[PDB]
């Protein structure tokens, strides 16, 4: 049965609620983004209207084979009427195709559902600027002050400089980057651009990337691994055993691997600056964990909420423990007392 924080009151609508069977009273199912915890339950046999971005609808049709007649893609930044209710989709600054959803309820209440997001000051000049929001359904993934990480731009600067140094010292080194979902594509695209290479990958991953409307993508990726010196592998293979095995397969073209694992936050963030990050190494293999986040840091989240000044906050992440819930509620009251709303 569907939890309350996936239902939008005063509507026939749910958000990210495909794993509960037929939800009583639901006339339209919204999907914020194509990550498995959110799409869990969708398949070619789904026969209700799904509302989403264009990029998410390309992935639904090609990867999960949802039939076209039930996919309802909406443009961003545009007022749309769905089953008699005004909605807007906003970029979430998460993975490709990820949205926030503004619902304008028939009684005058305005609700923002962030989906998964990385708050940014640019959102203070979207269509959010124009009216009051009563209720905020908030991605609280990193809602505690220990969660610090650098900007995406600093992280990419580190990765490009590291890869270009390594490969210029040793033209026979291979670069490998881990992946298990969409998101974080800048990591491997920025490294391949500095090296003058396409990114090589499996047929299944190439197919996924071809649904993302990234400009000039045919110029940047390939399934011909022999032609590429930046390879993508499943995240589970980014370890000394898996990388050794991969290097065997390349037929003596390479004699060193430099590998990247884009994680979210790890506790090595509480001590070390991006500048000072070092790899784990075994023989001719080195592995870097780099803190490339597609969720808000604590400070980014706090700025957003203190700007928006919602009347009520409903967390959508970390909701399963009383300790988590009490922590989050304490920070929400602090922010409200400090800002004065
Ligand atoms: Ni996500």
From Swiss-Prot:
It comes from the Eukaryota. It is found in: Nucleus. Expressed in brain, heart, kidney, liver, pancreas, placenta and skeletal muscle. Induction: During mitosis. The mRNA encoding this protein contains an internal ribosome entry site (IRES) in its 5'-UTR. This 5'-UTR generally suppresses translation while specifically promoting expression during mitosis, when cap-dependent translation may be impaired. May be required for DNA interstrand cross-link repair. Also required for checkpoint mediated cell cycle arrest in early prophase in response to mitotic spindle poisons. Possesses beta-lactamase activity, catalyzing the hydrolysis of penicillin G and nitrocefin. Exhibits no activity towards other beta-lactam antibiotic classes including cephalosporins (cefotaxime) and carbapenems (imipenem). Binds constitutively to TP53BP1. Binds CDC27, which is itself a component of the anaphase promoting complex (APC). Binds PIAS1. Belongs to the DNA repair metallo-beta-lactamase (DRMBL) family. This is DNA cross-link repair 1A protein. It comes from Homo sapiens (Human). The lineage of its organism: Eukaryota, Metazoa, Chordata, Craniata, Vertebrata.
């Amino acid at each position: 049965t569907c939890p309350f924080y996936k239902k939008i009151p005063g509507t026939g609508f749910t958000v990210d609620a495909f794993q509960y069977g037929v939800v009583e009273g639901c006339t339209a199912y919204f999907l914020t983004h194509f990550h498995s915890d959110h799409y869990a339950g969708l398949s070619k046999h789904f026969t209700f209207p799904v509302y989403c971005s264009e990029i998410t609808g390309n992935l639904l049709k090609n990867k999960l084979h949802v039939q076209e007649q039930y996919i309802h893609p909406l443009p961003l930044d545009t007022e749309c009427i769905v089953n008699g209710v005004k909605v807007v989709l906003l970029d979430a600054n998460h993975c490709p195709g990820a949205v926030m959803i503004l619902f304008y309820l028939p009684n005058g209440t305005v609700i923002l559902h962030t989906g998964d997001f990385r708050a940014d000051p640019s959102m203070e000049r979207s269509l959010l600027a124009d009216q009051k929001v009563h209720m905020l359904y908030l991605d609280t993934t990193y809602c505690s002050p220990e969660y610090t990480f650098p900007s995406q731009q600093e992280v990419i600067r580190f990765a490009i400089n590291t890869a270009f140094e390594a490969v210029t010292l040793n033209p026979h080194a291979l670069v490998v980057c881990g992946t298990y979902s969409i998101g974080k594509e800048k990591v491997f695209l920025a490294i391949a651009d500095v090296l003058g290479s396409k990114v090589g990958m499996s047929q299944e991953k190439y197919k996924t990337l071809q649904c993302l409307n990234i400009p000039e993508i045919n110029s940047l990726i390939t399934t011909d691994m022999c032609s590429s010196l930046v390879h993508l592998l499943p995240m589970m293979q980014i370890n000394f055993k898996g990388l050794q095995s991969h290097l065997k397969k390349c037929g003596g073209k390479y004699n060193q691997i430099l590998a990247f694992r884009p994680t979210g936050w790890t506790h090595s963030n509480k001590f070390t600056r991006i500048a000072d990050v070092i790899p784990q190494t075994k023989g001719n293999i080195s592995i870097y964990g780099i803190p490339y986040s597609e969720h808000s840091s604590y400070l980014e989240m706090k700025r957003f909420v203190q700007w928006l000044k919602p009347q009520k906050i409903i967390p959508t992440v970390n909701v399963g423990t009383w300790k988590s819930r009490s922590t989050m509620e304490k920070y929400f009251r602090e922010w409200k007392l400090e800002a004065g709303y």
